[PDB]
Design a protein around this ligand. Structure first.
Ligand SMILES: Nc1ccnc(=O)[nH]1
Ligand SMILES: [Zn+2]
Ligand SMILES: [Zn+2]
Lengths: 189, 182
């Protein structure tokens, strides 16, 4: 509405937040996240996606993707959407809240500065990344002024960090995205 | 706010009204003054002691305002800045406030941004950031600003965003203290 923050979720993302799913393996988890990436790109969104799991069971709780441009909202990153939807579903601003399960945020690329903090407040206890910062930098997409050893900063707060998971297919997904960005029409896109 | 087809965070009456009531505050202190009033209402509306609003830098026209809604809105990302920036990018229909053909936009804020919002402002397109309360003032009432890069103000300056702080600061603290007192 015009009297409430309202970020719309594309059909495939709604489905992604609708169908129950459980993926044990980190590979499996990131694999599904990378599926939403390809989708997102085909739904007019940035090449970024994320999902919050119950970490210790693999129960998908919520997913998000970059809807910045189509959404006319710079704050609509993949991490912000998944972290919110996740908090809304479990109905609490704290995923670290008393009773809730230990949550985990699987993202296609190392988080930017905005989301970096977004992660700290969320209440998740673990972050799992795919594409290293350089890969993202490598094609525009600025990570933003993150403080020294942000990764360390997270470990310190109890948020375990991991990067590189399925980085190969992640960087590929970034590239065909970039490959298909210009304005001159290409039927192969 | 748990929906399906979209992420939805409702705004309380006063805030709803704030984004639809025509307003033009030319002076800087006027903008900040208004923002502080919002803080009060927000506290009164089970919200955190934080408010903010985007104004067209030169004209002083209120474009959108946002408060802290984390708790009542079960969303840890709902800070005064995030909302005010997002409703502004909504009204103007663009994810870029520094976009072509749009009068420069400023974000007057009750306190200095948290590392999150910090990045948030950067991606918004706002061309200036005026703050009231300082960071120690914030950590003083028990709120985290998170780990920010050495000299964040520089980062903003360097990225085309003018930083200016300490405005009505003292008035912004009586509000913080009051909140902490209760
Ligand atoms: N500066 C801030 C600290 C904590 N929460 C907020 O909403 N804002
Ligand atoms: Zn981000
Ligand atoms: Zn903030």
């Amino acid at each position: 509405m015009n009297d409430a923050l309202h970020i719309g979720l594309p059909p495939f993302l709604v489905q992604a937040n609708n169908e129950p799913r459980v993926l044990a393996a980190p590979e499996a988890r990131m694999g599904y996240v990378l599926e939403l990436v390809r989708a997102n790109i085909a739904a007019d969104g940035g090449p970024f996606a994320a999902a919050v799991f119950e970490r210790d069971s693999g129960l998908l709780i919520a997913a998000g993707t970059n809807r910045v441009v189509p959404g006319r909202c710079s704050a609509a990153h993949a991490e912000i959407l998944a972290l919110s939807l996740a908090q809304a579903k479990l109905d609490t601003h704290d995923l670290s809240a008393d009773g809730l399960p230990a949550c985990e945020l699987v993202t296609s690329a190392e988080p930017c500065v905005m989301c970096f903090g977004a992660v700290i407040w969320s209440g998740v206890r673990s972050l799992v990344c795919a594409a290293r910062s350089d890969d993202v930098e490598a094609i525009g997409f600025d990570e933003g002024p993150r403080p020294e050893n942000w990764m360390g900063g997270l470990e310190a707060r109890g948020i375990t960090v991991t990067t590189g998971l399925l980085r190969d297919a992640a960087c590929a997904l970034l590239r065909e995205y970039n490959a298909c960005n210009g304005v001159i029409y290409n039927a192969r896109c």
